[PDB]
Design a protein around this ligand. Structure first.
Ligand SMILES: OCCCCCO[C@H]1O[C@H](CO)[C@@H](O)[C@H](O)[C@H]1O
Length: 632
């Protein structure tokens, strides 16, 4: 990495707010000398500012800049944009001693460009949320802050589905039968307060229709929902019940019940106000065909309805009854975007599994291309950037602790998460215009002082270690995703123009623009108002499965490429416009060779048989992910 320790006072900024930076100048030399920190402020390719500070330092002496010394004043940056701070530390000979880049996010609120992370109890402490772990939480949240995280998903900090956050000092989570976790409410409040200090929001996870089965009913049975057919929630004409091993765990209420709507909204309002939360991260147990209480005995299918057919109305009622609060509902596998397109969700959140049906058609949602397709489907239906839960690897064991997958064999060997696997999944979602909710503050020692990576639905579980390599590249990836949000997900659509990628020696590397096959440089274009982009995702010599359930048994580090050619056709553009464009082609990558820096590319303008111009773009390097940026 570097030792610049580049830090900002907040995670995110209002346009009318100053950015206070701190940075550390390290005289890593044997010579007493002026050490210079130069921080260039870029808005895409354009250098807006150079900031600069010099301090005379003795050998091995360091100096951290004080409040006021590096600042970007209020009203310096346009609103709802990402920026990059490109820092070089230099000695009195103009040798570069170190370099590090940091994004700056300026935005009204988190809804335009969500960058969402999880917070959850500590595995080493029964999954509890405890005051004694605040130091580790705060350390993780300092890191997420400098990664520009703007929102936080508080997972399993609730007492019960119907009493989510009572004003008591500590409560048991009695629905936790595996580890009997507890929550100290002062811990959750301190967490929320710390999130707020960074400019970020705190979302409370809770079900929307549920009550825990061993608590008195909050409403009488006229409000319950009933099964239309016998299945996994019990018998036709019985209350929809979630059970494990013939013990009822949860009962469900009718989304159309006005009394349930008023109950749960007010219960959430109170819970949220108790914690200082900013909104509701909603969840449902799964879809079902159901009957209202008064229809419970009907065998007439036309008297029944799919719960998902009423989610939009239910949500709209929640918004209306919770107007100052953010609202979203996890749509598992993204099955219902057309149903939910007009609901007043503030953000779209889909938890995606490899076994869901792809937005592509009749195939599992198993590859990087399937993640893009779902991101695009959401964008098309709502205009919003999809937040994706795509948990990585998920080691699983049988009863003899026999591994049921390769990742589980890595667990037995005390191995790490496969760094490039995680990064390629985050790249696939981001390059498509979405955001991979992957990062977690879990006070978990397998996270080695850094932030965790979500591996399973039960967020507190960390079976594999986060290498310092993964920690450091995750940070680079977050800066890229922030600094280039206006190119990735701000009125940017798929482009019908078809870019291709070649080596210097005759191979076409781009083979399947859908991203469903591996062993290729996955290459596709996007189109914004005055630009185009080309995403290059390196899958040379690797498979396209995003989850990497095999762990290290399936290598996910793709074959590094050098001196590639990318062609991009300029159908119907004149030679003079093409020549202007050809001088305005740039590249950036979150990978170590650039760490979000942008460079100019050598480009030639050629034509087809009919005088139609085509850019021939030289790409120095591709490690995992490159973005070409074409001003047009
Ligand atoms: O979209 C479906 C997500 C919910 C799946 C099961 O969740 C439930 O069960 C989980 C444990 O399996 C709990 O951690 C959680 O609080 C509770 O809501």
């Amino acid at each position: 990495g570097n030792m610049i320790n580049l830090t900002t006072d907040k995670a995110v900024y209002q346009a009318g707010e100053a950015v206070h930076l701190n940075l550390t100048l390290n005289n890593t030399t044997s010579l007493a000398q002026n050490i210079t920190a130069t921080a260039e402020v870029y808005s895409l390719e354009n250098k807006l500012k150079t900031l600069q500070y010099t301090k005379y330092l003795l050998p091995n002496e360091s100096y951290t800049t004080q409040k006021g010394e590096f600042v970007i004043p209020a009203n310096s940056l346009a609103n709802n944009r990402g920026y990059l701070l490109k820092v070089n530390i230099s000695d009195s000979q103009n040798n570069i001693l170190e370099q590090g880049n940091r994004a700056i996010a300026v935005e009204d609120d988190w809804r335009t460009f969500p960058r969402y992370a999880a917070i959850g109890g500590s595995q080493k402490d029964n999954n509890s949320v405890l005051t004694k772990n605040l130091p580790d939480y705060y350390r993780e949240l300092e890191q997420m802050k400098n990664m520009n995280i703007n929102s936080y998903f508080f997972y399993d900090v609730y007492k019960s589905a119907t009493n989510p956050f009572p004003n008591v000092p500590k409560f048991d989570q009695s629905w936790n039968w595996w580890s009997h976790s507890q929550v100290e409410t002062d811990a959750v409040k301190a967490l929320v307060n710390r999130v707020h200090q960074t400019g970020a929001v705190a979302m409370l996870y809770n079900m929307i229709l549920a009550q825990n089965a061993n608590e008195t009913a909050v409403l009488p049975d006229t409000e319950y929902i009933y099964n239309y057919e016998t299945g996994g929630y019990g018998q036709n004409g019985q209350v929809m019940t979630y059970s494990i091993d013939d013990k009822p765990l949860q009962y469900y209420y009718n989304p159309l019940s006005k009394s349930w709507q008023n109950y749960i909204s007010n219960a959430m309002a109170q819970a949220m106000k108790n914690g200082g939360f900013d909104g509701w991260q909603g969840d449902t147990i799964g879809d079902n065909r159901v009957l209202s209480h008064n229809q419970k005995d009907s065998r007439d299918i036309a008297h029944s309805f799919m719960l998902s057919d009423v989610y939009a109305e239910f949500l709209n009622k929640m918004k209306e009854k919770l107007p100052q609060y953010y609202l979203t509902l996890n749509d598992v596998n993204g099955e219902n975007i057309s149903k939910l397109a007009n609901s007043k969700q503030d953000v779209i959140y889909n938890e995606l599994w490899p076994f869901g049906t792809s937005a592509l058609g009749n195939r599992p949602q198993e590859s990087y291309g399937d993640l893009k397709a779902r991101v695009d489907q959401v964008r098309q239906a709502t205009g919003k950037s999809l937040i994706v839960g795509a948990y990585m690897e998920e080691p699983k064991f049988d009863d003899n602790r026999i591994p049921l997958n390769g990742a589980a064999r890595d667990v037995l060997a005390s191995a790490t998460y496969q760094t490039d696997a995680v990064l390629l999944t985050t790249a696939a979602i981001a390059a498509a215009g979405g955001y991979h909710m992957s990062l977690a503050a879990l006070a978990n020692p397998n996270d080695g002082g850094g932030v965790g990576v979500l591996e399973t639905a039960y967020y507190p579980t960390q079976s594999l270690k986060v290498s310092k390599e993964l920690n450091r590249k995750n940070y680079h990836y977050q800066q890229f995703i922030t600094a280039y949000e206006n190119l990735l997900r701000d009125k940017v659509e798929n482009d019908s123009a078809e870019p291709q990628t070649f080596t210097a020696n005759g191979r076409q590397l781009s083979q399947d623009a859908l991203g469903i096959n591996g062993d290729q440089v996955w290459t596709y274009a996007k189109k914004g108002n005055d630009f185009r982009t080309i995403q290059l995702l390196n899958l040379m010599g690797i498979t396209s499965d995003w989850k990497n359930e095999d762990g290290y048994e399936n290598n996910k580090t793709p074959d590094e490429q050098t001196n590639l050619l990318v062609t991009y056709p300029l159908t119907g553009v004149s030679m003079a416009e093409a020549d202007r464009i050809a001088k305005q082609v740039y590249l950036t990558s979150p990978d170590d060779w650039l760490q979000s820096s942008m460079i100019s590319l050598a480009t030639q303008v050629k034509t087809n048989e009919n005088g139609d111009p085509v850019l021939y773009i030289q790409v120095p390097r591709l490690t995992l992910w490159d973005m070409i940026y074409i001003l047009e």
